[PDB]
Amino acid sequence: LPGIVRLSIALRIQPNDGPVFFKVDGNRTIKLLTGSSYKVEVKIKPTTLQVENISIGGVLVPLELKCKEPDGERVVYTGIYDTEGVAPTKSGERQPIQITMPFTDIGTFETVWQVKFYNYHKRDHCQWGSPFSVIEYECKPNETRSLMWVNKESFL
Ligand code: NA
């Protein structure tokens, strides 16, 4: 419908392009591996939208426009998310990490994931649970509640 942005985010662990899983804590915790890397696949509509990248916990993931969604109506952007240098989660089974994705001249998508970062050599602790193919978001750049960018303030 007019003014609805739909975006899905998928992660596939390298080198096998395998699935990513969540666990329930208290409430969905995404299980991610440190010292590793992920294919990131972003599917957007409308197809007139332009994304340049996605940032995950402060890590920049440059996105490249790839093609039209096989068997679908979105456009597909992919990049590689590098988790080399990310600290494993030390306590409390999860931690919040910031997701940020700018759409040029439309607005910015932000959300918080709950994540457990696993030590590289505990990949067998990480790669199991409930696999999810994507996280699907419905976004409204002109919702009443969408915070407008304040470009300037002037006392007159
Ligand atoms: Na807006």
Side-chain angles (χ1 to χ4, degrees), residues 47-119:
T47 63
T48 52
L49 293 174
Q50 165 198 339
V51 316
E52 289 272 353
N53 51 62
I54 181 169
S55 291
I56 304 176
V59 178
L60 178 65
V61 187
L63 294 170
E64 181 180 358
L65 174 55
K66 289 304 299 295
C67 62
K68 291 272 235 221
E69 182 193 7
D71 294 346
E73 66 189 24
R74 300 194 189 183
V75 296
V76 179
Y77 282 81
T78 68
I80 295 296
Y81 167 46
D82 190 342
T83 63
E84 192 64 79
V86 178
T89 304
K90 287 267 279 172
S91 83
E93 283 304 295
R94 48 159 43 184
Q95 71 185 97
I97 73 161
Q98 183 64 242
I99 313 302
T100 310
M101 184 161 55
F103 298 69
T104 307
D105 298 340
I106 292 284
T108 293
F109 164 73
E110 286 203 329
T111 194
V112 177
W113 292 351
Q114 297 294 330
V115 171
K116 178 163 174 183
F117 281 119
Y118 280 84
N119 297 264

Side-chain angles (χ1 to χ4, degrees), residues 106-107 140-143 146-149:
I106 292 284
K140 286 174 194 199
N142 291 282
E143 228 270 355
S146 171
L147 295 171
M148 301 189 294
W149 177 255

Side-chain angles (χ1 to χ4, degrees), residues 117-129:
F117 281 119
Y118 280 84
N119 297 264
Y120 177 74
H121 65 289
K122 297 185 153 200
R123 168 171 190 143
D124 49 359
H125 300 218
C126 189
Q127 299 308 307
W128 80 272

Side-chain angles (χ1 to χ4, degrees), residues 138-153:
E138 180 180 72
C139 297
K140 286 174 194 199
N142 291 282
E143 228 270 355
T144 309
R145 286 171 287 182
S146 171
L147 295 171
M148 301 189 294
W149 177 255
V150 179
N151 200 47
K152 193 166 149 81
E153 161 198 319

